[PDB]
Amino acid sequence: ELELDEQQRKRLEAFLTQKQKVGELKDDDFEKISELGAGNGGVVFKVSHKPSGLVMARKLIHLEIKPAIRNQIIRELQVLHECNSPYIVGFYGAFYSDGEISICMEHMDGGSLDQVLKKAGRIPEQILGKVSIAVIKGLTYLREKHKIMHRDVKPSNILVNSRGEIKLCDFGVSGQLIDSMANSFVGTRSYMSPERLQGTHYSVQSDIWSMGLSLVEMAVGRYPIPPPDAKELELMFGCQRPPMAIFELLDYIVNEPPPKLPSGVFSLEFQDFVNKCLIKNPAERADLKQLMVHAFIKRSDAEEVDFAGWLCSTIGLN
Amino acid sequence: ELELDEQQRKRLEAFLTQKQKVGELKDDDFEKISELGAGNGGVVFKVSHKPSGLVMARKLIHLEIKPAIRNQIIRELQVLHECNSPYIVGFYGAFYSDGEISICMEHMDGGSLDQVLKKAGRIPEQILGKVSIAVIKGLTYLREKHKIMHRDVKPSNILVNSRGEIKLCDFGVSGQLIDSMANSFVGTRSYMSPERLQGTHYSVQSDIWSMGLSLVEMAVGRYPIPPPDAKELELMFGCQRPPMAIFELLDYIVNEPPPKLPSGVFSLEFQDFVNKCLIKNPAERADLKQLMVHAFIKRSDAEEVDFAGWLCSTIGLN
Ligand SMILES: Nc1ncnc2c1ncn2[C@@H]1O[C@H](COP(=O)(O)OP(=O)(O)OP(O)(O)=S)[C@@H](O)[C@H]1O
Ligand SMILES: Nc1ncnc2c1ncn2[C@@H]1O[C@H](COP(=O)(O)OP(=O)(O)OP(O)(O)=S)[C@@H](O)[C@H]1O
């Protein structure tokens, strides 16, 4: 389940290979082709890197970095956003220029699943099965090798390509950066509690909920709170005042039953899978190991799904 | 202990009075006098407001805000940074212009305690007694009326004035803002876990530790980790390879004994007070109510301390 198949191992070595061959990244070596999407602190562009001729994704975060910490922050960006997993998007490098931090990444040609959701209307179960595996494995990797974080996965944080790969975005860079800046000084210090430095406030559990929710979102084709009543259901699915504001949604999430998949239209194991994710008490909610052996995942792992053909057809790639 | 004495009540009404009299805040109505200090996302200036003739502190956060969310963010800034407590710095208003969010505040003429620490060398116990009360009361207020947050108090977040008032800064605006931007969408949504929306991951306990540490810092006159060995002590206090890097400090904090006050030179009750704050297990660490009745605080509350005279003399005000 967990270690890499040699095709995976090769694809990774092959990226790392290229990365060292790219040389030093600077702004006037990039030619902007199009906008891929909007990040929290800025915009992700598809760009060609003039020297190597490589196509990349370049996330531009408009953010002022004091000279005294200018690198050291960056040192840590490199350290924090360079991964070596099939389930995390490839990292080329990161640089600063004129109040812009640039993060250069592997270009995923299929885009994010929020865009793909719009193209498709709904993403089918078997497809989400393979998405789940990927997210679970990515989050596993991030947790073993990188972080103590709230990682709350949205469809906009999941990337796909025409090779049929599914990878997490390198998401939440802006929050990370401001936090980094908040925790650096002259001389080295920290006012963070011991409790917070082994960072188990941030158990995997919160990540799982968000994933659960993303899965229902993608499966039914809309943000799932407030749930859709029976009117909507039969219509969406063939017989299986409104816009609440934010204070209300937040209380709804805390105080109301968790959203869930409609019956009949989705397999029992999928329904159970997401129910495990959305158990409201995080003591009782599934953890990542639990999900990796859940019925849905076992079945999905064995299914031969033509992910890449589904995707290309959905978004019109070729 | 908790509700306001009529001099306090008056000072508050009096600020709120003025605030409504200031009218609308914009950039070209401000004349920059000097820099008060550096914030995480920018700089805090002392400024005169041309129309009212009021002196203010204006925090400039260099940060791009998409038009689609431009207000709504701000709506929430107003809501989040306007308090009505003697122990939180007064809020005039907040506005945006040209990639700058401005936060206008009551000017505290004594500056922050990090600057005052530099002027004084060390801050004496009785003085820190009154500082403690203020911090405890401020954090109490923030918790009852405002927030679910990590609020980790540093000396740079504590403000004093020549009236002898002690108030928390309106600190952590940059982190708050990026978080706000991270959690807003088109349509209203949230991928935050229920657990995180009643925000008790963030118990008062982490705030307390940081305060504890700030108190020792101020009392001995340096960031207290690594502790100073007996060499330093006798010298600082009259007989009561080095710079560790950040990975090490962080492990030191998790794995080593908590720092503490030197004996003899500080009262037992002060020593105990900070020891309660720095208990490494947050289950056993003091909470805010506990501290409000601790021996140190009881004694400090009754002491008549000429705070304002100490301060003016230390920083040379008049
Ligand atoms: N490597 C990539 N290839 C293709 N599209 C990408 C890539 N990385 C990001 N995107 C697109 O850009 C959007 C935002 O990227 P994310 O990494 O999800 O950023 P964010 O977490 O929203 O904001 P940050 O990192 O805090 S500035 C995604 O939803 C995708 O549409
Ligand atoms: N109202 C004020 N009066 C006088 N000095 C102030 C005032 N507010 C802030 N300062 C000074 O500016 C410094 C930074 O302000 P803080 O509110 O502590 O900001 P920060 O939390 O470091 O950064 P932010 O809010 O995330 S941009 C303080 O250490 C003080 O020196």
Side-chain angles (χ1 to χ4, degrees), chain A residues 1-147 149-240 242-318, chain B residues 1-147 149-240 242-318:
Chain A
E1 275 182 328
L2 47 150
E3 233 107 317
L4 312 176
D5 110 68
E6 261 280 74
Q7 195 197 338
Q8 293 182 308
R9 180 56 259 175
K10 276 336 183 87
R11 281 188 174 166
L12 258 0
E13 235 152 37
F15 187 84
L16 186 39
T17 291
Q18 286 163 241
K19 175 207 325 267
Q20 301 150 341
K21 192 91 74 250
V22 173
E24 208 185 291
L25 304 172
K26 60 278 221 299
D27 172 58
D28 69 34
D29 286 344
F30 288 106
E31 308 166 290
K32 195 162 115 185
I33 297 159
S34 50
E35 178 161 326
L36 295 165
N40 188 35
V43 181
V44 184
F45 295 103
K46 180 183 181 179
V47 307
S48 133
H49 180 235
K50 273 284 259 176
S52 306
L54 289 162
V55 181
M56 296 182 168
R58 182 193 183 175
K59 180 180 275 174
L60 269 205
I61 300 144
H62 285 287
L63 193 39
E64 185 35 55
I65 313 283
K66 303 85 148 186
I69 65 173
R70 192 153 279 189
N71 19 297
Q72 317 137 240
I73 286 307
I74 294 167
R75 166 169 305 112
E76 179 207 30
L77 280 191
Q78 217 278 355
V79 174
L80 265 58
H81 302 299
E82 195 164 43
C83 298
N84 194 261
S85 162
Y87 308 99
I88 315 296
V89 72
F91 174 77
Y92 284 119
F95 57 94
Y96 187 84
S97 47
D98 309 23
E100 289 164 35
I101 107 89
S102 265
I103 297 202
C104 299
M105 297 171 282
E106 172 184 9
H107 177 239
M108 296 286 287
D109 62 0
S112 44
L113 288 177
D114 61 319
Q115 303 157 325
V116 175
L117 191 56
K118 290 194 283 278
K119 260 303 200 304
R122 281 197 280 282
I123 296 172
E125 178 174 338
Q126 283 204 333
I127 290 305
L128 295 175
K130 302 283 176 185
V131 166
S132 295
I133 285 174
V135 170
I136 283 163
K137 296 197 185 176
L139 285 173
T140 289
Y141 175 91
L142 290 169
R143 286 186 79 95
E144 309 319 303
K145 316 302 241 150
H146 270 288
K147 56 143 76 332
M149 293 206 76
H150 299 294
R151 275 307 216 64
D152 284 44
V153 174
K154 308 181 216 67
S156 71
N157 300 317
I158 309 161
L159 296 165
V160 297
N161 69 20
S162 66
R163 281 140 80 107
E165 273 162 342
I166 309 155
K167 317 187 182 185
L168 297 182
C169 288
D170 182 32
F171 62 101
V173 177
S174 51
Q176 200 293 124
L177 271 169
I178 284 292
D179 176 81
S180 277
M181 296 151 71
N183 283 271
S184 69
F185 314 86
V186 158
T188 43
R189 324 182 175 214
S190 177
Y191 300 84
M192 219 132 169
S193 228
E195 10 139 289
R196 294 214 298 158
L197 265 8
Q198 313 140 319
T200 305
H201 264 149
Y202 333 119
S203 73
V204 70
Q205 316 286 1
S206 169
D207 315 8
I208 280 170
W209 163 275
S210 181
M211 183 184 79
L213 194 57
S214 295
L215 287 164
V216 167
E217 175 174 359
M218 288 189 290
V220 315
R222 66 187 259 291
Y223 183 70
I225 309 153
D229 66 343
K231 173 59 187 297
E232 269 170 280
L233 292 196
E234 76 193 346
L235 288 261
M236 293 196 275
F237 296 104
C239 87
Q240 142 168 299
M244 75 192 303
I246 213 269
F247 186 103
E248 331 182 43
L249 207 188
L250 296 189
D251 281 274
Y252 190 107
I253 290 161
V254 177
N255 295 316
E256 300 305 302
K260 58 195 199 315
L261 295 175
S263 20
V265 40
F266 297 106
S267 82
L268 269 187
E269 317 83 285
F270 190 26
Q271 281 172 85
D272 191 62
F273 177 85
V274 301
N275 284 338
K276 294 321 189 213
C277 291
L278 300 162
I279 290 158
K280 297 224 313 196
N281 174 357
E284 285 190 15
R285 180 171 319 134
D287 75 337
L288 281 174
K289 292 164 283 138
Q290 179 172 169
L291 297 179
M292 258 311 299
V293 294
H294 188 286
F296 180 67
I297 300 287
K298 279 201 219 297
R299 188 197 84 203
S300 293
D301 209 20
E303 284 165 357
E304 300 161 327
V305 173
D306 190 323
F307 192 90
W310 178 85
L311 176 56
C312 289
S313 296
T314 298
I315 70 170
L317 271 178
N318 274 278
Chain B
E1 275 182 328
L2 47 150
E3 233 107 317
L4 312 176
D5 110 68
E6 261 280 74
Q7 195 197 338
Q8 293 182 308
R9 180 56 259 175
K10 276 336 183 87
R11 281 188 174 166
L12 258 0
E13 235 152 37
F15 187 84
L16 186 39
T17 291
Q18 286 163 241
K19 175 207 325 267
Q20 301 150 341
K21 192 91 74 250
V22 173
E24 208 185 291
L25 304 172
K26 60 278 221 299
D27 172 58
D28 69 34
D29 286 344
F30 288 106
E31 308 166 290
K32 195 162 115 185
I33 297 159
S34 50
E35 178 161 326
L36 295 165
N40 188 35
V43 181
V44 184
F45 295 103
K46 180 183 181 179
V47 307
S48 133
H49 180 235
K50 273 284 259 176
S52 306
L54 289 162
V55 181
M56 296 182 168
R58 182 193 183 175
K59 180 180 275 174
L60 269 205
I61 300 144
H62 285 287
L63 193 39
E64 185 35 55
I65 313 283
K66 303 85 148 186
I69 65 173
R70 192 153 279 189
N71 19 297
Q72 317 137 240
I73 286 307
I74 294 167
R75 166 169 305 112
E76 179 207 30
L77 280 191
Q78 217 278 355
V79 174
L80 265 58
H81 302 299
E82 195 164 43
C83 298
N84 194 261
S85 162
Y87 308 99
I88 315 296
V89 72
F91 174 77
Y92 284 119
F95 57 94
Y96 187 84
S97 47
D98 309 23
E100 289 164 35
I101 107 89
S102 265
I103 297 202
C104 299
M105 297 171 282
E106 172 184 9
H107 177 239
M108 296 286 287
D109 62 0
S112 44
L113 288 177
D114 61 319
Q115 303 157 325
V116 175
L117 191 56
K118 290 194 283 278
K119 260 303 200 304
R122 281 197 280 282
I123 296 172
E125 178 174 338
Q126 283 204 333
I127 290 305
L128 295 175
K130 302 283 176 185
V131 166
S132 295
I133 285 174
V135 170
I136 283 163
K137 296 197 185 176
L139 285 173
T140 289
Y141 175 91
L142 290 169
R143 286 186 79 95
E144 309 319 303
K145 316 302 241 150
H146 270 288
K147 56 143 76 332
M149 293 206 76
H150 299 294
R151 275 307 216 64
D152 284 44
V153 174
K154 308 181 216 67
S156 71
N157 300 317
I158 309 161
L159 296 165
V160 297
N161 69 20
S162 66
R163 281 140 80 107
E165 273 162 342
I166 309 155
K167 317 187 182 185
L168 297 182
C169 288
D170 182 32
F171 62 101
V173 177
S174 51
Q176 200 293 124
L177 271 169
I178 284 292
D179 176 81
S180 277
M181 296 151 71
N183 283 271
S184 69
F185 314 86
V186 158
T188 43
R189 324 182 175 214
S190 177
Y191 300 84
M192 219 132 169
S193 228
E195 10 139 289
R196 294 214 298 158
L197 265 8
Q198 313 140 319
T200 305
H201 264 149
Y202 333 119
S203 73
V204 70
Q205 316 286 1
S206 169
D207 315 8
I208 280 170
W209 163 275
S210 181
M211 183 184 79
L213 194 57
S214 295
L215 287 164
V216 167
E217 175 174 359
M218 288 189 290
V220 315
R222 66 187 259 291
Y223 183 70
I225 309 153
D229 66 343
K231 173 59 187 297
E232 269 170 280
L233 292 196
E234 76 193 346
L235 288 261
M236 293 196 275
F237 296 104
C239 87
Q240 142 168 299
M244 75 192 303
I246 213 269
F247 186 103
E248 331 182 43
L249 207 188
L250 296 189
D251 281 274
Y252 190 107
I253 290 161
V254 177
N255 295 316
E256 300 305 302
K260 58 195 199 315
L261 295 175
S263 20
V265 40
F266 297 106
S267 82
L268 269 187
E269 317 83 285
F270 190 26
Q271 281 172 85
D272 191 62
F273 177 85
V274 301
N275 284 338
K276 294 321 189 213
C277 291
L278 300 162
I279 290 158
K280 297 224 313 196
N281 174 357
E284 285 190 15
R285 180 171 319 134
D287 75 337
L288 281 174
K289 292 164 283 138
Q290 179 172 169
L291 297 179
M292 258 311 299
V293 294
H294 188 286
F296 180 67
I297 300 287
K298 279 201 219 297
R299 188 197 84 203
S300 293
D301 209 20
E303 284 165 357
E304 300 161 327
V305 173
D306 190 323
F307 192 90
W310 178 85
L311 176 56
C312 289
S313 296
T314 298
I315 70 170
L317 271 178
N318 274 278

